[PDB]
Amino acid sequence: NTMKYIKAADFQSAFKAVNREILENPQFVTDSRIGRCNEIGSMTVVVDTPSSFKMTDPRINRISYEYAEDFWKFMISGGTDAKEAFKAYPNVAKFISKPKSDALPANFNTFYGPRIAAQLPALLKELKEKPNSRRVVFQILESSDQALLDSDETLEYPCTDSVTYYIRDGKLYTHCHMRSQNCAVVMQLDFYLQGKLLHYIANECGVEVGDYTHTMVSAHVFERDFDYVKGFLD
Amino acid sequence: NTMKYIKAADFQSAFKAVNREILENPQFVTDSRIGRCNEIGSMTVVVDTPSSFKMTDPRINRISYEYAEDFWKFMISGGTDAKEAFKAYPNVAKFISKPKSDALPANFNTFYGPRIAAQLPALLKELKEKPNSRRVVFQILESSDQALLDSDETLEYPCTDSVTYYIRDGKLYTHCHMRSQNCAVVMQLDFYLQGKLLHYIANECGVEVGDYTHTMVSAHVFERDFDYVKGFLD
Numbered sequence: 001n002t003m004k005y006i007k008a009a010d011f012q013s014a015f016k017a018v019n020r021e022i023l024e025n026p027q028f029v030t031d032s033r034i035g036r037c038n039e040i041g042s043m044t045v046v047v048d049t050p051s052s053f054k055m056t057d058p059r060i061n062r063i064s065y066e067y068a069e070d071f072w073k074f075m076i077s078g079g080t081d082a083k084e085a086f087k088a089y090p091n092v093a094k095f096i097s098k099p100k101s102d103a104l105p106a107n108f109n110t111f112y113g114p115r116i117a118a119q120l121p122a123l124l125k126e127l128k129e130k131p132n133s134r135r136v137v138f139q140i141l142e143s144s145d146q147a148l149l150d151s152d153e154t155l156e157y158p159c160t161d162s163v164t165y166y167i168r169d170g171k172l173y174t175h176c177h178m179r180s181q182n183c184a185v186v187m188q189l190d191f192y193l194q195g196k197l198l199h200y201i202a203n204e205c206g207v208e209v210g211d212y213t214h215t216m217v218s219a220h221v222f223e224r225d226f227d228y229v230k231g232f233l234d
Numbered sequence: 235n236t237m238k239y240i241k242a243a244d245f246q247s248a249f250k251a252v253n254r255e256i257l258e259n260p261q262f263v264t265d266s267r268i269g270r271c272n273e274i275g276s277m278t279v280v281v282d283t284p285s286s287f288k289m290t291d292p293r294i295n296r297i298s299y300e301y302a303e304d305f306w307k308f309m310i311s312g313g314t315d316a317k318e319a320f321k322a323y324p325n326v327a328k329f330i331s332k333p334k335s336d337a338l339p340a341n342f343n344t345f346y347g348p349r350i351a352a353q354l355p356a357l358l359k360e361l362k363e364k365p366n367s368r369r370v371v372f373q374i375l376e377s378s379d380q381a382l383l384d385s386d387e388t389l390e391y392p393c394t395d396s397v398t399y400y401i402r403d404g405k406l407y408t409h410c411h412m413r414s415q416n417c418a419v420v421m422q423l424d425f426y427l428q429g430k431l432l433h434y435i436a437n438e439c440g441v442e443v444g445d446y447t448h449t450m451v452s453a454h455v456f457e458r459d460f461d462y463v464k465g466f467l468d
């Protein structure tokens with residue numbers, strides 16, 4: 001039976017367990033916007049030790065850690081010069097190009113970094129100053145992104161919905177809610193970015209780290225990636 | 235050990251199981267913005283039969299179904315005349331009053347209805363026309379709501395983060411992500427509103443209903459409500 005709740009000691013064990021479950025016990029086998037995938041709806045993943053966001057198995061190699069670190073620096077710096085930041089990676093071109101349609105402005109982008117940057121002052125203030133706040137939610141996906149739905153744009157319609165942080169008894173807890181997760185490939189990047197970000201937040205707040213929860217409305221592995229996944233399982 | 239994943243046949247069984255777990259096996263006992271509560275972080279609740287959103291046990295009476303239905307009509311109609319809609323309920327006054335601070339405008343409100351109304355056309359179009367879309371997310375909590383964090387306003391800083399809908403094989407699946415859930419009281423209302431809304435969506439799309447998933451970054455019961463909860467358990 002499809003296991004939707006996965007608790008693991010570290011990011012890599014969670015990553016392997018999620019991918020194995022999607023391959024072996026999918027809830028749906030579905031033809032999606034970008035091809036056929038196995039899918040589990042509404043998976044919840046808990047990582048006990050969020051310092052482990054750099055996975056050690058070199059067979060999990062579709063997101064290199066050079067790329068992941070370049071992406072982290074691009075994101076946390078809150079800039080929009082993706083062409084410069086990812087000039088060494090030509091295959092990300094369709095995700096970093098200017099909008100084509102005149103409908104939405106040319107300043108429009110879906111980069112997470114500027115959105116995190118805009119919210120950091122108010123959210124850090126709440127996180128540091130309102131004891132036991134439940135209100136600290138970084139919004140990534142925005143309703144204004146819905147202008148992308150009926151367009152031919154290739155920009156990411158944000159896969160990450162929100163990241164909630166809360167502190168209890170000196171520890172920072174994190175809940176990343178994903179609208180849509182490519183578990184075999186991009187999740188390696190998402191885990192890296194979220195691991196870096198939560199440590200950034202914990203350090204700004206002077207607190208230690210609890211655990212990390214990752215919910216995914218669609219947790220999927222494309223059929224084209226099954227051989228890749230099998231290559232890192234066992 | 236604290237059970238964070240609860241699967242139940244109907245909303246009431248989920249409701250009772252969640253409340254029991256928070257009372258008996260909290261992750262945190264914490265003094266919050268609005269008083270001491272037992273709390274479980276990042277709970278996931280699955281309801282197999284989402285038609286069951288009106289609970290039958292009359293001891294679960296803090297949200298009357300007259301009030302819940304008035305709230306539903308107020309929400310789905312997308313209006314802002316809360317004073318008129320809830321005139322028969324004086325205790326909701328602090329949640330429906332105009333903003334006090336000149337910082338945010340007088341048109342500012344955090345009612346869910348207008349936000350659902352604004353997104354319905356684009357999201358229904360995606361849901362009906364893009365097969366197996368993963369993109370249909372109603373955003374409730376918005377980053378612009380963060381202006382409430384450092385204010386003395388009593389308006390709700392949205393407890394509901396987002397509601398994602400997706401269709402696979404003729405069935406509508408729903409994932410409601412809550413930032414913050416008062417599980418003993420308001421969750422009765424949230425379950426009613428989400429049950430009504432998902433049936434509204436399924437009917438607009440001409441599809442049947444799958445299941446309903448409810449994730450809560452903070453799932454809590456205030457100590458002041460423990461006697462009430464005990465009164466409906468068993």
Ligand SMILES: Cc1cc2nc3c(=O)[nH]c(=O)nc-3n(C[C@H](O)[C@H](O)[C@H](O)COP(=O)(O)O)c2cc1C
Nearest residue numbers: 062082086091092095096156157159182185186189
């Ligand atoms: C700003 C930006 C947004 C991106 N968005 C997506 C995306 O939404 N979906 C996706 O699959 N890859 C996206 N990518 C590319 C991934 O980060 C990564 O390069 C890719 O998953 C590697 O795929 P491959 O090794 O199979 O070619 C994005 C890259 C950038 C720089």
Ligand SMILES: Cc1cc2nc3c(=O)[nH]c(=O)nc-3n(C[C@H](O)[C@H](O)[C@H](O)COP(=O)(O)O)c2cc1C
Nearest residue numbers: 296316320325326329330390391393416419420423
């Ligand atoms: C527009 C609106 C927003 C509300 N927001 C909240 C809220 O954020 N938190 C809350 O506890 N009750 C809120 N309420 C009140 C609840 O819907 C409900 O009346 C209350 O939980 C009943 O509490 P009581 O029976 O313990 O008095 C709101 C009511 C309205 C009309």
Ligand SMILES: Nc1ccn([C@H]2C[C@H](O)[C@@H](COP(=O)(O)O)O2)c(=O)n1
Nearest residue numbers: 033157159160180181182186187368
């Ligand atoms: N941070 C991100 C951004 C996007 N995606 C993936 C999920 C989908 O495989 C695809 C987005 O497609 P869709 O919008 O149809 O969900 O990219 C991901 O895994 N992580």
Ligand SMILES: Nc1ccn([C@H]2C[C@H](O)[C@@H](COP(=O)(O)O)O2)c(=O)n1
Nearest residue numbers: 134267391393394414415416420421
């Ligand atoms: N639809 C809603 C709106 C709010 N709340 C609850 C959660 C908290 O008990 C409180 C909101 O307080 P806070 O903003 O501190 O989380 O109201 C809820 O349960 N459901």
